[PDB]
Amino acid sequence: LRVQFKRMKAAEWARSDVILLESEIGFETDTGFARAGDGHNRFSDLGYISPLDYNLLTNKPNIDGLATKVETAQKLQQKADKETVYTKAESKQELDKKLNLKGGVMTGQLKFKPAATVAYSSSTGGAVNIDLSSTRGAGVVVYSDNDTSDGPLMSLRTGKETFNQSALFVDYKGTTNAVNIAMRQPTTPNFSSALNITSGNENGSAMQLRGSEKALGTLKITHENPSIGADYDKNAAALSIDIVKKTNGAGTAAQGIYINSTSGTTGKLLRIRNLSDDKFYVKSDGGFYAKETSQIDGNLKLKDPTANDHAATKAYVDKAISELKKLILKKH
Amino acid sequence: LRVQFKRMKAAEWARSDVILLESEIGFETDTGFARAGDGHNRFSDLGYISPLDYNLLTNKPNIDGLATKVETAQKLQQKADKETVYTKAESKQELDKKLNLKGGVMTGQLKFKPAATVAYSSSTGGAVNIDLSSTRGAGVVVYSDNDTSDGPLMSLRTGKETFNQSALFVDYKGTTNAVNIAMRQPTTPNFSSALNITSGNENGSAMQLRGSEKALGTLKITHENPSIGADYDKNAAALSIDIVKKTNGAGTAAQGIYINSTSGTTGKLLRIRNLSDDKFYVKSDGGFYAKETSQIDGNLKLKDPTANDHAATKAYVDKAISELKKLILKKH
Amino acid sequence: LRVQFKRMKAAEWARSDVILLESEIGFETDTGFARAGDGHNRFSDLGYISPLDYNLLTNKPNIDGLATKVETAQKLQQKADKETVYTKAESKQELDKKLNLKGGVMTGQLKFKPAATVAYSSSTGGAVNIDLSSTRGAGVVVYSDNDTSDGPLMSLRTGKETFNQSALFVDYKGTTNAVNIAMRQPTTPNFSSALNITSGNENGSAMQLRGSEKALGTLKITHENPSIGADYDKNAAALSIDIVKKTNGAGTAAQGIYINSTSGTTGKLLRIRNLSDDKFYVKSDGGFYAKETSQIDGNLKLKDPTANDHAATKAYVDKAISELKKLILKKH
Ligand SMILES: OC[C@H]1O[C@@H](O[C@H]2[C@H](O)[C@@H](O)[C@@H](O)O[C@@H]2CO)[C@H](O)[C@@H](O)[C@H]1O
Numbered sequence: 001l002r003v004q005f006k007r008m009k010a011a012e013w014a015r016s017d018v019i020l021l022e023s024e025i026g027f028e029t030d031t032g033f034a035r036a037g038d039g040h041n042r043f044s045d046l047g048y049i050s051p052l053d054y055n056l057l058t059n060k061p062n063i064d065g066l067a068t069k070v071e072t073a074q075k076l077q078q079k080a081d082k083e084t085v086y087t088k089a090e091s092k093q094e095l096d097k098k099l100n101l102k103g104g105v106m107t108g109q110l111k112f113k114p115a116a117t118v119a120y121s122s123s124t125g126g127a128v129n130i131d132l133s134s135t136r137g138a139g140v141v142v143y144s145d146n147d148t149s150d151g152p153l154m155s156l157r158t159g160k161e162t163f164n165q166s167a168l169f170v171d172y173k174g175t176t177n178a179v180n181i182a183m184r185q186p187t188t189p190n191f192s193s194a195l196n197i198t199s200g201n202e203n204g205s206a207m208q209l210r211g212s213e214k215a216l217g218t219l220k221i222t223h224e225n226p227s228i229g230a231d232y233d234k235n236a237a238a239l240s241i242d243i244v245k246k247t248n249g250a251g252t253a254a255q256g257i258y259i260n261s262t263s264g265t266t267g268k269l270l271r272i273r274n275l276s277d278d279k280f281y282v283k284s285d286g287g288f289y290a291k292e293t294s295q296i297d298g299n300l301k302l303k304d305p306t307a308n309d310h311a312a313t314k315a316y317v318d319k320a321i322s323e324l325k326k327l328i329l330k331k332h
Numbered sequence: 333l334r335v336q337f338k339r340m341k342a343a344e345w346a347r348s349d350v351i352l353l354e355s356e357i358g359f360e361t362d363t364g365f366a367r368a369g370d371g372h373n374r375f376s377d378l379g380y381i382s383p384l385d386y387n388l389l390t391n392k393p394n395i396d397g398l399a400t401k402v403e404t405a406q407k408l409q410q411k412a413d414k415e416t417v418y419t420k421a422e423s424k425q426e427l428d429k430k431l432n433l434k435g436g437v438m439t440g441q442l443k444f445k446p447a448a449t450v451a452y453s454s455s456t457g458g459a460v461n462i463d464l465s466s467t468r469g470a471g472v473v474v475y476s477d478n479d480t481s482d483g484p485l486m487s488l489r490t491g492k493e494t495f496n497q498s499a500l501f502v503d504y505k506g507t508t509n510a511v512n513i514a515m516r517q518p519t520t521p522n523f524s525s526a527l528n529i530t531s532g533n534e535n536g537s538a539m540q541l542r543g544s545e546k547a548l549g550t551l552k553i554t555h556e557n558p559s560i561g562a563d564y565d566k567n568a569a570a571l572s573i574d575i576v577k578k579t580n581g582a583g584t585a586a587q588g589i590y591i592n593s594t595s596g597t598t599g600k601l602l603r604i605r606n607l608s609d610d611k612f613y614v615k616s617d618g619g620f621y622a623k624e625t626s627q628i629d630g631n632l633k634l635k636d637p638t639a640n641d642h643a644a645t646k647a648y649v650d651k652a653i654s655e656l657k658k659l660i661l662k663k664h
Numbered sequence: 665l666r667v668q669f670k671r672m673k674a675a676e677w678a679r680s681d682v683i684l685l686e687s688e689i690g691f692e693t694d695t696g697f698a699r700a701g702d703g704h705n706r707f708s709d710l711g712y713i714s715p716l717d718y719n720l721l722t723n724k725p726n727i728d729g730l731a732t733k734v735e736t737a738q739k740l741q742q743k744a745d746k747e748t749v750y751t752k753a754e755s756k757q758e759l760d761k762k763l764n765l766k767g768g769v770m771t772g773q774l775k776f777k778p779a780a781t782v783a784y785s786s787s788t789g790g791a792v793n794i795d796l797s798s799t800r801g802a803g804v805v806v807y808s809d810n811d812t813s814d815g816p817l818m819s820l821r822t823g824k825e826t827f828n829q830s831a832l833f834v835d836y837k838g839t840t841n842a843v844n845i846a847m848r849q850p851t852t853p854n855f856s857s858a859l860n861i862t863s864g865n866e867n868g869s870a871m872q873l874r875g876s877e878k879a880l881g882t883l884k885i886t887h888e889n890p891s892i893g894a895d896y897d898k899n900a901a902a903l904s905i906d907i908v909k910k911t912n913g914a915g916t917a918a919q920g921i922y923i924n925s926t927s928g929t930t931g932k933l934l935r936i937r938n939l940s941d942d943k944f945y946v947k948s949d950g951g952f953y954a955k956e957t958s959q960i961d962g963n964l965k966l967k968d969p970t971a972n973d974h975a976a977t978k979a980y981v982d983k984a985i986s987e988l989k990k991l992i993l994k995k996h
Pocket residue numbers: 158159160477787797837
């Protein structure tokens with residue numbers, strides 16, 4: 001037996017009306033495939049003589065180990081996209097432009113414009129609040145070594161006439177000077193001043209000073225000769241006063257120096273000394289003393305003498321002469 | 333020949349004891365599948381007559397191109413999760429709340445509380461350190477155009493009596509005034525002062541001033557009439573002094589003006605002029621000069637005259653009279 | 665019929681020259697596989713009698729649902745890597761080191777070194793610019809409650825002699841004192857001063873003051889007795905002046921107090937009172953008044969008397985005596 005089977009091309013079977021007997025094999029000549037009869041179905045309705053089911057295969061690949069598009073996408077959706085997020089480098093680049101609380105260097109202007117909760121009161125208020133209670137350094141240190149400039153080191157301005165606080169308030173306890181102004185010996189000379197004050201206020205002193213010294217002056221002024229030359233400073237003074245009219249005024253009636261004691265003092269109201277020796281003084285009652293010969297380009301009105309060293313008046317002289325003239329003419 | 337084969341249902345083969353001859357075909361009537369004999373195995377132990385090995389298939393899918401769960405997970409593990417990381421927008425939102433070193437606007441309080449390395453000394457110390465050496469602007473510019481307020485523009489306070497530094501130190505070189513206080517002509521008038529100083533310190537002057545002017549006063553004061561009216565300021569003064577007791581004190585012995593030269597000066601100790609003409613002065617030795625008629629409501633003690641223009645004393649008058657009385661009575 | 669087929673091992677077929685007839689089955693005894701003849705090809709060139717094409721299988725897996733390495737990699741490439749990006753925690757850790765514009769606490773030094781656009785001029789310049797126009801708090805509040813320190817609360821320094829701005833400028837409008845210095849009654853006593861000024865400048869006053877008061881002094885000084893003891897302050901003064909030579913100088917010619925009116929005043933140039941009663945004064949023309957007995961340790965040069973209360977001169981006395989001597993001797 002060399003057995004051969006009913007056979008033709010797949011497409012010819014496809015339209016054959018031949019019914020294979022149950023288990024009778026038929027052959028597709030162009031595919032090599034067989035199919036077996038069931039006794040009723042046409043060829044195209046028979047299945048192949050061997051399984052075609054993925055689940056019966058051997059050497060299957062690991063389908064279950066492979067990632068699904070859905071599950072991968074869900075996992076990607078939790079991850080941050082490059083474009084919506086700064087790198088470490090761009091983060092640091094941005095942060096290096098900001099000021100550390102530990103400290104840093106400003107190259108531009110720091111403005112304050114408080115919104116003002118209340119901005120407090122005392123040692124806990126202010127837009128800038130500096131507490132040096134636990135440290136030995138300075139608070140605010142401003143300086144310039146520039147040759148010239150357009151602005152002061154520090155400027156304080158108030159714009160409204162009702163303003164009811166000070167520009168600068170110094171409340172000081174300690175053992176040196178609350179406020180100290182040193183104007184160092186000039187090389188190129190200024191025609192100006194350590195401290196300069198002008199007021200146009202007619203209802204208040206330009207400067208007020210109250211002190212309560214046991215044995216010093218409330219204000220102490222010392223002039224020191226700038227030169228070793230004994231008389232170089234001959235036009236200088238410890239205190240100089242001028243009294244002037246208003247530009248285009250008719251003049252002035254202001255006094256130079258006015259001294260009073262509202263409670264009454266027993267001290268000398270004006271005491272002038274040289275080398276610590278009294279030279280001239282006005283006592284608390286208005287009597288004066290002068291150490292040396294003095295001059296008046298005028299007369300002197302005073303009372304009649306009662307002691308030998310009293311200056312005589314014209315009355316006293318005239319009377320003593322008139323007495324002598326009478327007696328001497330003789331008396332009956 | 334129409335060949336048919338030993339046949340029955342798969343499940344019936346499954347328990348048949350029939351041994352197919354080597355290569356003899358048997359048919360599963362309900363599956364369509366054949367199996368071929370090996371001459372020993374029961375039907376259920378024969379394999380199908382055609383391969384069932386994934387590796388022999390054609391049109392395989394690209395299994396190797398597909399991603400594995402393991403390898404995807406490893407790759408996801410290097411990526412940043414959305415939730416642990418700021419977006420660019422939230423980054424910028426946070427950074428815009430911080431101050432740029434280039435500059436910016438504070439809306440709240442900046443406090444300093446130095447921890448203090450040493451906080452240095454001189455032109456490199458301070459919690460706030462401003463160096464204007466290479467620029468032409470101002471250092472610290474504080475101002476207010478508010479009508480009223482509860483606090484000063486600037487406040488300096490020291491709390492302990494041992495405190496051994498100044499509240500404010502000005503070390504100045506330059507060509508204008510180190511410190512300048514302008515109190516602008518008021519519209520609504522203050523009863524106060526450009527500069528006001530009080531000290532309760534009995535061992536130190538409230539204010540100390542030293543200068544070394546060639547031809548000016550160490551302190552120069554000018555009063556200017558506030559009005560064009562010649563005598564409007566008739567109660568005004570360039571300098572006014574008061575001398576008062578302590579509240580509930582018995583009084584005071586303090587002097588008004590005390591002038592000394594500890595090294596000895598040849599200048600006039602008190603010089604009073606009007607329109608630049610000497611009117612009254614006290615010389616370095618205590619002699620005074622007065623330009624016009626003067627009055628004492630009292631006597632004047634002085635020495636006996638020796639020149640024609642010297643004031644005479646009662647002694648001198650009495651003696652000259654007593655001489656004339658004698659001579660004239662005549663002498664034996 | 666029990667049909668058997670041409671058969672041998674796969675490897676033996678592999679080199680057989682037997683040609684199966686068209687559809688004649690041949691069997692591989694070691695694999696179980698059949699192949700069918702085409703009438704020309706050797707065994708090894710026939711295909712199996714049943715399909716081996718993945719596309720004809722049933723129960724296929726969802727290959728299309730699975731993610732490709734390429735497509736996953738493209739998706740991963742858009743995601744940010746953990747290592748190149750800050751977590752929220754490290755972001756906040758960095759940001760907490762920076763200063764909020766809302767406010768914050770500096771623990772280190774804030775330096776300014778302006779690059780200077782121009783740094784402006786007026787109420788819009790300065791490295792630190794504080795505008796309190798809409799608020800009621802203080803501007804700059806510096807204080808210390810430390811026992812001692814190495815630096816001042818505030819320090820202003822200019823290094824070059826040409827410097828042509830002020831260290832401190834106060835431009836004040838308002839109703840209290842522009843600048844106020846309180847030196848609180850000491851418990852441990854300082855030998856120093858509320859305000860201390862030194863100048864080595866020979867071409868400018870150490871301090872300049874101009875005021876235009878209707879009825880006050882430009883400078884007002886009050887000394888108050890520190891004690892209830894009436895004469896405790898007997899060495900004190902409201903104003904004290906000293907006039908000294910330069911260290912290693914030959915001396916000085918400086919004046920003590922110099923008073924002038926450059927425009928001419930009709931006021932009293934020096935007025936001394938006690939309990940508000942005139943005790944001594946120098947009029948605008950140089951005439952003086954003294955309330956009580958006075959003394960000169962010297963002579964007084966003055967003009968010849970013309971009124972009864974005028975002091976007499978030696979000339980006047982000598983002449984009146986010489987007249988009496990003549991008349992009395994009698995006249996022919
Ligand atoms: O910071 C600017 C404010 O200026 C205020 O106006 C006055 C100021 O009060 C006065 O002293 C002087 O400086 O002139 C100013 C106007 O030129 C304004 O009223 C206020 O609105 C601000 O512009």
